[PDB]
Amino acid sequence: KILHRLLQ
Amino acid sequence: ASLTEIEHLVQSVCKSYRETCQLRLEDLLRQRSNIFSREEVTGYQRKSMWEMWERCAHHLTEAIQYVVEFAKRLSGFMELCQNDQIVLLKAGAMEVVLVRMCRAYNADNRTVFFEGKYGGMELFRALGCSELISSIFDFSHSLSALHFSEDEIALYTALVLINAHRPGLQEKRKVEQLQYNLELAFHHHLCKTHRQSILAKLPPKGKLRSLCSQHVERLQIFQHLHPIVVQAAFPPLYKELFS
Numbered sequence: 001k002i003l004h005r006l007l008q
Numbered sequence: 009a010s011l012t013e014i015e016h017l018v019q020s021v022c023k024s025y026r027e028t029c030q031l032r033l034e035d036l037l038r039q040r041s042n043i044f045s046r047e048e049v050t051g052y053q054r055k056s057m058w059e060m061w062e063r064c065a066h067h068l069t070e071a072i073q074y075v076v077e078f079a080k081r082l083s084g085f086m087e088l089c090q091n092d093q094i095v096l097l098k099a100g101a102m103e104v105v106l107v108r109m110c111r112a113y114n115a116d117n118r119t120v121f122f123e124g125k126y127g128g129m130e131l132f133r134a135l136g137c138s139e140l141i142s143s144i145f146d147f148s149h150s151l152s153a154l155h156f157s158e159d160e161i162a163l164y165t166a167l168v169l170i171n172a173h174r175p176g177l178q179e180k181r182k183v184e185q186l187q188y189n190l191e192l193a194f195h196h197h198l199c200k201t202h203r204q205s206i207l208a209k210l211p212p213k214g215k216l217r218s219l220c221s222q223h224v225e226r227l228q229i230f231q232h233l234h235p236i237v238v239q240a241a242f243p244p245l246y247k248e249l250f251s
């Protein structure tokens with residue numbers, strides 16, 4: 001879920 | 009596709025890279041005389057395996073964060089679906105960092121920039137990953153012999169990321185199209201700058217794949233030895249990408 005937060 | 013369109017992509021990719029390159033090349037070059045002393049090296053070697061692993065995982069995570077930003081600013085990337093964005097980053101983020109690392113590598117004395125100073129591979133002996141470390145150093149040495157300009161690193165790393173062969177892609181054709189446009193941009197730039205000689209000297213995909221596989225394997229070995237350390241002390245993003 002960290003990748004997800006970074007992308008938006 | 010016009011020639012003006014391709015040139016526009018070249019400059020867009022180069023700009024995206026400059027804005028996300030982490031350290032300016034000049035700053036890395038200026039610090040090359042700043043080399044860890046024998047005492048500082050011994051200091052690193054006496055550190056515990058798990059502390060050294062944690063430190064390396066943190067710095068990799070920092071580097072990876074800049075690559076994620078590179079991707080976000082990379083023409084076409086955010087137009088791909090989120091599934092594919094994640095697939096490409098999971099498979100390519102570490103590979104990009106490994107390529108970018110040649111900038112911080114000094115081929116004259118075989119040292120790499122790490123925590124403020126330059127040190128050889130003996131610096132990392134506490135990790136217990138001699139084969140991995142020497143492979144990374146060998147890969148960086150091979151890349152250094154090509155004498156990449158910053159623009160070349162920008163274009164080459166864009167292609168390392170935008171790879172339509174990555175398993176798990178839902179919109180393969182869309183990624184294929186962007187990859188092809190970036191290949192044109194990269195190869196056009198090499199043609200214009202009379203640097204097509206480097207194409208044959210670029211390392212095969214398997215070299216980068218090997219490094220990432222070794223990294224994952226050495227992590228698994230370590231995480232078996234110190235599971236609570238990884239759970240408690242490793243960066244969340246690192247675990248998401250590599251565990």
Ligand SMILES: CCS(=O)(=O)c1ccc(CC(=O)Nc2ccc(-c3ccc(CC(C)C)c(C#N)c3)c(C(F)(F)F)c2)cc1
Nearest residue numbers: 029030031064067071108109111112120121122137144223
């Ligand atoms: C990359 C963008 S830059 O602006 O050029 C830049 C920006 C900053 C830096 C400093 C830096 O973070 N160096 C550093 C950090 C960790 C490591 C490293 C250490 C050990 C391991 C094996 C371990 C995980 C079991 C791995 C792996 N895989 C990577 C290295 C180097 F690879 F050299 F050993 C250097 C260097 C360039």
